[PDB]
Design a binder for this molecule. Structure first.
Ligand SMILES: OC[C@H]1O[C@@H](O[C@H]2[C@H](O)[C@@H](O)[C@H](O[C@H]3[C@H](O)[C@@H](O)[C@H](O[C@H]4[C@H](O)[C@@H](O)[C@H](O[C@H]5[C@H](O)[C@@H](O)[C@H](O[C@H]6[C@H](O)[C@@H](O)[C@H](O)O[C@@H]6CO)O[C@@H]5CO)O[C@@H]4CO)O[C@@H]3CO)O[C@@H]2CO)[C@H](O)[C@@H](O)[C@@H]1O
Length: 207
């Protein structure tokens, strides 16, 4: 987002570093992270729209930036569940709950997307996650026989389709601002991949 704004409340949690719902592991233990309420997570009617986004969060004591790694199931609109190293920067740990303002911001990252091909993926069914993206990824499409096919983003932060075809995949990704970039991902196997793997991408959303 270039500009954005939300109000709500934050609490804190030790979860989300490992086994978070968005399958973004490994998460370095000293990263500042957050779980996010389902209503804001599924922005624009896209499941996990905000997975792997970064938020700037302002509390009573200051501002800080967090990586969104997990779902906050019991969260109301605007609600966030921060890691302790983030919460203590913007509020007092003696509080179980604080008022916050927050917004989607550009990821503090460098380089291009990487893609994660989920175990079980094949030409018949594949789940493809985008990582290292500067803004939330709202949409992913691949080209098959001259037409662009929309992939459904899943709760587990991968985009899914079926009968994708043989050969390398031409893909296009759309961010929360409507910016579109295109890339190529190496071919999917004929049989389901026994293990998940990552592939370096060659494109990034614009600044
Ligand atoms: O030779 C005879 C004829 O064959 C035809 O071709 C057939 C072919 O024979 C057949 O093998 C093939 O079967 C494939 C299916 O088409 C395809 O749908 C299927 O996809 C499965 C996949 O195997 C499986 O791994 C995957 O599991 C996902 C799951 O969906 C997902 O929900 C779950 O996510 C969870 C996370 O793992 C978890 O961490 C998180 O917390 O929760 C998540 C959500 O709950 O993840 C798992 C694992 O990744 O599901 C998909 C989809 O259901 O794969 C089959 C085997 O490859 O079909 C072909 C076409 O029908 C020819 O057409 C004909 O000519 C021949 O004569």
């Amino acid at each position: 987002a270039y500009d954005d704004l939300h109000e709500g409340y934050a609490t804190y949690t030790g979860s989300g570093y490992s086994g978070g719902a968005f399958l973004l592991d490994p998460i370095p233990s000293d990263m500042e992270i957050t779980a996010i309420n389902p209503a804001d997570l599924n922005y624009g009617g896209v499941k996990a729209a905000l997975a792997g986004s970064y938020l700037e969060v302002e509390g009573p004591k200051g501002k800080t930036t967090v990586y969104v790694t997990d779902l906050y199931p019991e969260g109301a609109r605007g609600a966030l569940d921060l890691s302790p190293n983030a919460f203590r920067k913007i509020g007092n740990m003696k509080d179980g709950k604080i008022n916050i303002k927050w917004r989607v911001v550009k990821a503090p990252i460098t380089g291009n997307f990487t893609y994660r091909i989920k175990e079980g993926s094949s030409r018949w069914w594949a789940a493809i996650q985008v990582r290292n993206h500067k803004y939330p990824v709202m949409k992913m499409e691949y080209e098959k026989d001259g037409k662009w096919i929309n992939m459904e983003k899943m709760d587990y932060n991968h985009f899914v389709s079926t009968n994708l075809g043989t050969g390398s995949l031409k893909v296009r990704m759309t961010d929360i601002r409507g910016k579109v970039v295109k890339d190529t991902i190496p071919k999917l196997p004929e049989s389901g991949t026994s293990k998940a793997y990552t592939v370096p991408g060659h494109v990034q959303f614009p600044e």
